[PDB]
Design an enzyme around this catalytic site. Sequence first.
Site, PDB file in Angstrom:
ATOM      1  N   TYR A 234     -19.910 119.003  80.407  1.00  0.00           N
ATOM      2  CA  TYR A 234     -18.992 117.941  80.914  1.00  0.00           C
ATOM      3  C   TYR A 234     -19.824 116.738  81.334  1.00  0.00           C
ATOM      4  O   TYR A 234     -19.615 115.658  80.718  1.00  0.00           O
ATOM      5  CB  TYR A 234     -18.061 118.433  82.025  1.00  0.00           C
ATOM      6  CG  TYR A 234     -17.555 117.456  83.070  1.00  0.00           C
ATOM      7  CD1 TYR A 234     -16.352 116.768  82.972  1.00  0.00           C
ATOM      8  CD2 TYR A 234     -18.220 117.339  84.268  1.00  0.00           C
ATOM      9  CE1 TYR A 234     -15.883 115.944  83.993  1.00  0.00           C
ATOM     10  CE2 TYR A 234     -17.764 116.535  85.303  1.00  0.00           C
ATOM     11  CZ  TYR A 234     -16.596 115.817  85.177  1.00  0.00           C
ATOM     12  OH  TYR A 234     -16.231 115.085  86.281  1.00  0.00           O
ATOM     13  N   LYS A 238     -19.640 113.100  79.558  1.00  0.00           N
ATOM     14  CA  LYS A 238     -19.086 112.116  80.517  1.00  0.00           C
ATOM     15  C   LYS A 238     -20.024 110.913  80.609  1.00  0.00           C
ATOM     16  O   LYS A 238     -19.531 109.761  80.875  1.00  0.00           O
ATOM     17  CB  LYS A 238     -18.862 112.788  81.872  1.00  0.00           C
ATOM     18  CG  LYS A 238     -17.417 113.172  82.156  1.00  0.00           C
ATOM     19  CD  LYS A 238     -16.675 112.094  82.913  1.00  0.00           C
ATOM     20  CE  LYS A 238     -15.813 111.222  82.041  1.00  0.00           C
ATOM     21  NZ  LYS A 238     -14.695 110.688  82.847  1.00  0.00           N
TER      22      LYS A 238
HETATM   23  N1  LIG Z   1     -12.184 116.539  90.044  1.00  0.00           N
HETATM   24  C1  LIG Z   1     -12.758 115.507  90.635  1.00  0.00           C
HETATM   25  O1  LIG Z   1     -12.697 115.315  91.842  1.00  0.00           O
HETATM   26  C2  LIG Z   1     -13.529 114.550  89.772  1.00  0.00           C
HETATM   27  C3  LIG Z   1     -14.902 114.631  89.645  1.00  0.00           C
HETATM   28  C4  LIG Z   1     -15.574 113.433  89.581  1.00  0.00           C
HETATM   29  C5  LIG Z   1     -14.936 112.371  88.972  1.00  0.00           C
HETATM   30  N2  LIG Z   1     -13.701 112.557  88.472  1.00  0.00           N
HETATM   31  C6  LIG Z   1     -13.318 111.970  87.139  1.00  0.00           C
HETATM   32  O2  LIG Z   1     -12.173 111.098  87.278  1.00  0.00           O
HETATM   33  C7  LIG Z   1     -11.144 111.448  86.331  1.00  0.00           C
HETATM   34  C8  LIG Z   1     -10.001 112.058  87.115  1.00  0.00           C
HETATM   35  O3  LIG Z   1      -9.408 113.245  86.473  1.00  0.00           O
HETATM   36  P1  LIG Z   1      -8.674 114.246  87.496  1.00  0.00           P
HETATM   37  O4  LIG Z   1      -9.674 115.322  87.773  1.00  0.00           O
HETATM   38  O5  LIG Z   1      -8.032 113.423  88.566  1.00  0.00           O
HETATM   39  O6  LIG Z   1      -7.401 114.878  86.780  1.00  0.00           O
HETATM   40  P2  LIG Z   1      -7.498 115.978  85.651  1.00  0.00           P
HETATM   41  O7  LIG Z   1      -6.246 116.782  85.628  1.00  0.00           O
HETATM   42  O8  LIG Z   1      -8.808 116.686  85.719  1.00  0.00           O
HETATM   43  O9  LIG Z   1      -7.525 114.975  84.423  1.00  0.00           O
HETATM   44  C9  LIG Z   1      -6.935 115.320  83.153  1.00  0.00           C
HETATM   45  C10 LIG Z   1      -6.150 114.126  82.668  1.00  0.00           C
HETATM   46  O10 LIG Z   1      -6.671 113.697  81.379  1.00  0.00           O
HETATM   47  C11 LIG Z   1      -5.622 113.842  80.457  1.00  0.00           C
HETATM   48  N3  LIG Z   1      -6.069 114.171  79.116  1.00  0.00           N
HETATM   49  C12 LIG Z   1      -6.624 115.349  78.699  1.00  0.00           C
HETATM   50  N4  LIG Z   1      -6.802 115.411  77.407  1.00  0.00           N
HETATM   51  C13 LIG Z   1      -6.271 114.226  76.951  1.00  0.00           C
HETATM   52  C14 LIG Z   1      -6.157 113.719  75.661  1.00  0.00           C
HETATM   53  N5  LIG Z   1      -6.560 114.394  74.589  1.00  0.00           N
HETATM   54  N6  LIG Z   1      -5.544 112.522  75.531  1.00  0.00           N
HETATM   55  C15 LIG Z   1      -5.111 111.893  76.634  1.00  0.00           C
HETATM   56  N7  LIG Z   1      -5.185 112.263  77.907  1.00  0.00           N
HETATM   57  C16 LIG Z   1      -5.787 113.459  77.987  1.00  0.00           C
HETATM   58  C17 LIG Z   1      -4.767 114.959  81.027  1.00  0.00           C
HETATM   59  O11 LIG Z   1      -3.608 115.077  80.201  1.00  0.00           O
HETATM   60  P3  LIG Z   1      -2.773 116.403  80.477  1.00  0.00           P
HETATM   61  O12 LIG Z   1      -1.654 115.664  81.238  1.00  0.00           O
HETATM   62  O13 LIG Z   1      -2.287 117.268  79.327  1.00  0.00           O
HETATM   63  O14 LIG Z   1      -3.777 117.136  81.313  1.00  0.00           O
HETATM   64  C18 LIG Z   1      -4.662 114.419  82.438  1.00  0.00           C
HETATM   65  O15 LIG Z   1      -3.903 113.234  82.642  1.00  0.00           O
HETATM   66  C19 LIG Z   1     -11.865 112.307  85.283  1.00  0.00           C
HETATM   67  O16 LIG Z   1     -12.532 111.505  84.315  1.00  0.00           O
HETATM   68  C20 LIG Z   1     -12.901 113.044  86.132  1.00  0.00           C
HETATM   69  O17 LIG Z   1     -13.997 113.510  85.361  1.00  0.00           O
HETATM   70  C21 LIG Z   1     -12.896 113.480  89.140  1.00  0.00           C
END
Ligand SMILES: NC(=O)c1ccc[n+]([C@@H]2O[C@H](COP(=O)([O-])OP(=O)(O)OC[C@H]3O[C@@H](n4cnc5c(N)ncnc54)[C@H](OP(=O)(O)O)[C@@H]3O)[C@@H](O)[C@H]2O)c1
Length: 482
Positions: A234, A238
């Site tokens: 990842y 990323k």
């Molecule tokens: N977890 C954390 O605290 C964390 C870590 C550090 C930074 N971030 C980054 O900030 C962002 C926040 O993500 P999150 O963790 O809040 O929510 P998440 O649920 O982990 O994010 C998944 C999202 O991406 C979408 N997605 C997946 N595959 C896709 C595709 N093929 N086409 C279009 N959309 C697609 C998902 O669609 P679906 O609706 O089907 O899932 C959903 O909206 C990410 O880039 C993450 O790496 C967050």
Amino acid sequence: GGIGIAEFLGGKNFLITGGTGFLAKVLIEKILRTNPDVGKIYVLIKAKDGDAALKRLHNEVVDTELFSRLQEIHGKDYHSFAARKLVPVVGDVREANVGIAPELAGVIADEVDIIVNSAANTTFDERYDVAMDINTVGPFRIMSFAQRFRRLKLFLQVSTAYVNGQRQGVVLEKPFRLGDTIAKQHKNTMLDIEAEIKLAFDHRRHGDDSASFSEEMKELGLERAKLHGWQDTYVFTKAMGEMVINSMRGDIPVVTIRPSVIESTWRDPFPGWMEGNRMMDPVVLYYGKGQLSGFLADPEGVLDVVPADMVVNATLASMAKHGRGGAAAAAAAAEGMHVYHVASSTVNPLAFGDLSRFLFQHFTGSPYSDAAGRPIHVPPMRLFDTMEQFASYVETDALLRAGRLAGAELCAKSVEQTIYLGSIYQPYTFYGGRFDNGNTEALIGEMSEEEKARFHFDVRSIEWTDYITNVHIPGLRKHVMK
Ligand SMILES: NC(=O)c1ccc[n+]([C@@H]2O[C@H](COP(=O)([O-])OP(=O)(O)OC[C@H]3O[C@@H](n4cnc5c(N)ncnc54)[C@H](OP(=O)(O)O)[C@@H]3O)[C@@H](O)[C@H]2O)c1
């Protein structure tokens, strides 16, 4: 004075990629509620078709407790307002123009001033083809489409700080360019996107769905992430995506926000909102009930956690600051990626030691009633320096096998998992990182005290002792009700 956050979303229109997205969604809420004279949010959504995606927009965004405050300021208007402002766009970042039907794709690339791209696959050990396709080749597809946009004023990319990979010590906000590797056994010296692109999915028996071959690809992804100096499949892709977005933005002005470890909103809509059982949580969760007397973790070492709450407000500060296009700004040369570390590990660090404390202290005072609604036995988290002293805890298999002592070796495939569990979290529990918070600090020092009111991302105001025991694990436990 100040920086203008409210005013800015004046009438502006967004394309945004976080549909069920945890982070993106909190953002959407925040925008509508901050200024209900936004131009609209387009909201890409995965779906069989577009009325099957109105469903997603309703069931997972409008009919969620997060939006309650909004549902309150709008009267019987909200459901109207929601329809006037949230345009579902059936879509997929895995295919070109992020899978948007064309007639619309163009309608969009004409209206929109800001693209926020939070979409991602966040599985650690994810197979290569998948991670690469979403995380690193997707950002191409968008940026590509972004270039055909008419008045696009700013492109905002959401990647981790864990993007900073095996970098040890204090780590400054600096970009990745398309050649960079983080290597300062196994090691390579330059990163050939080409070469990666081909191992990850060239032929790939497009039709072979052997969970064997599916392993080969999970395994392969890690191999490389660790060849070039990232922990896992990842954080690799990323970063590679950061490299793509760096290569491909042209005249366009991106921001790169790097939040590390999102958690429950610290106060804005209301403290205590969360989605999803990803990383920290499923352990906090496990130890609420059975199976974790102890974890494998330098207890002087840090976990960089931020409130989802504060990520979003950093996000909105950068947007207002950096996508206020100008003319002498567009007539002057291209500037650099705006990187923002939105993170705690340099200023108010939360140590795995105080963490293990607050787990105990929160599961004691009001513990988890079990299947029979009979309350739990949870002591203080026991943190180990070694896979020695952690595996020295199969003293449980036998010990925890006390339910059998009334009258007058045992099989432990149960430790084999609590060991694996901890093998896997190792690299993060022993993270050399510390994420300089610097640009992001100067962004605050730019705001009116009036704005620091609405849009707090002073990581410093967090009382860990409180936010973990009282705000996060509650708001967590609540969501995973289902
Ligand atoms: N977890 C954390 O605290 C964390 C870590 C550090 C930074 N971030 C980054 O900030 C962002 C926040 O993500 P999150 O963790 O809040 O929510 P998440 O649920 O982990 O994010 C998944 C999202 O991406 C979408 N997605 C997946 N595959 C896709 C595709 N093929 N086409 C279009 N959309 C697609 C998902 O669609 P679906 O609706 O089907 O899932 C959903 O909206 C990410 O880039 C993450 O790496 C967050």
